[PDB]
From a paper:
The 12 related human ESCRT-III proteins form filaments that constrict membranes and mediate fission, including during cytokinetic abscission. Human ESCRT-III proteins have conserved helical core domains that mediate filament formation, and variable C-terminal tails that contain short peptide elements called MIT-Interacting Motifs (MIMs). MIMs bind cofactors that contain MIT (Microtubule-Interacting and Trafficking) domains (Hurley and Yang, 2008). MIT domains are simple three helix bundles, but they can bind MIM elements in at least seven distinct ways, which we have termed Type 1–7 binding modes.
The MIT domain of the microtubule severing AAA+ ATPase SPASTIN binds CHMP1B, which reportedly localizes the enzyme to the midbody where it clears spindle microtubules to allow abscission. The SPASTIN MIT domain is unusual in binding specifically to three different ESCRT-III proteins: CHMP1B, CHMP3, and IST1. We determined a high resolution (1.15 Å) crystal structure of the SPASTIN MIT-IST1 complex using a SPASTIN MIT112-196 construct. The structure revealed that the IST1 MIM344-366 adopts an amphipathic helix that buries its hydrophobic side chains in the SPASTIN MIT H1/H3 groove (Type 3 binding). Four hydrophobic IST1 residues, F352, L355, F359, and L362 are shown binding in the H1/H3 groove of the SPASTIN MIT domain. The interface buries 1400 Å2 of surface area over 32 residues from both faces and is further stabilized with four hydrogen bonds and seven salt bridges. The IST1 and CHMP1B MIM elements exhibit similar binding modes, but with two significant differences: (1) The longer CHMP1B helix extends three additional turns beyond the IST1 N-terminus, and (2) the MIT H1/H3 groove expands to accommodate the longer CHMP1B helix, with a maximal displacement of 2.5 Å at the N-terminus of helix 3. IST1 binding is slightly tighter than CHMP1B binding, likely owing to enhanced hydrophobic interactions with the SPASTIN H1/H3 groove. IST1 buries two aromatic and two aliphatic side chains, whereas the CHMP1B binding element lacks aromatic residues and buries only three aliphatics.
Author numbering:
A (entry chain A): 112 to 195
B (entry chain B): 349 to 366
Write the structure that this text describes.
């Protein structure tokens, strides 16, 4: 339900953020580090998107909105990881 | 306010450099 979504969302956001920072840094030789952070972030995204959110109401709706943004990001993250 | 959509845009920018 919403509480679990919030935890996975925040953890995924932090792991994907550090992976992106490393991947964006033009210096060479650090893609292997980015890969490991992307894998951690993808795991959190997958779990968070799959959390069952039941019923209506504001907190359920907010959680589902986070899950939709997580889903867009998951597709992108898996697509990036295949290239590294 | 940085959210996941902002991170998705960062992936798009990386992809355009591939
Ligand atoms: Ca936004
Ligand atoms: Cl978000």
């Amino acid at each position: 339900e919403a509480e679990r979504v919030r935890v996975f969302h925040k953890q995924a956001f932090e792991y994907i953020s550090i992976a992106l920072r490393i991947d964006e840094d033009e210096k060479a030789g650090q893609k292997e580090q980015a890969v490991e952070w992307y894998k951690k972030g993808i795991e959190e995204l997958e779990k968070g998107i799959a959390v069952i959110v039941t019923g209506q109401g504001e907190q359920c709706e907010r959680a589902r909105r986070l899950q939709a943004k997580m889903m867009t990001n998951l597709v992108m993250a898996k697509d990036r990881l295949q290239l590294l | 306010d940085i959210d996941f959509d902002d991170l998705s845009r960062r992936f798009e920018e990386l992809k355009k450099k591939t």
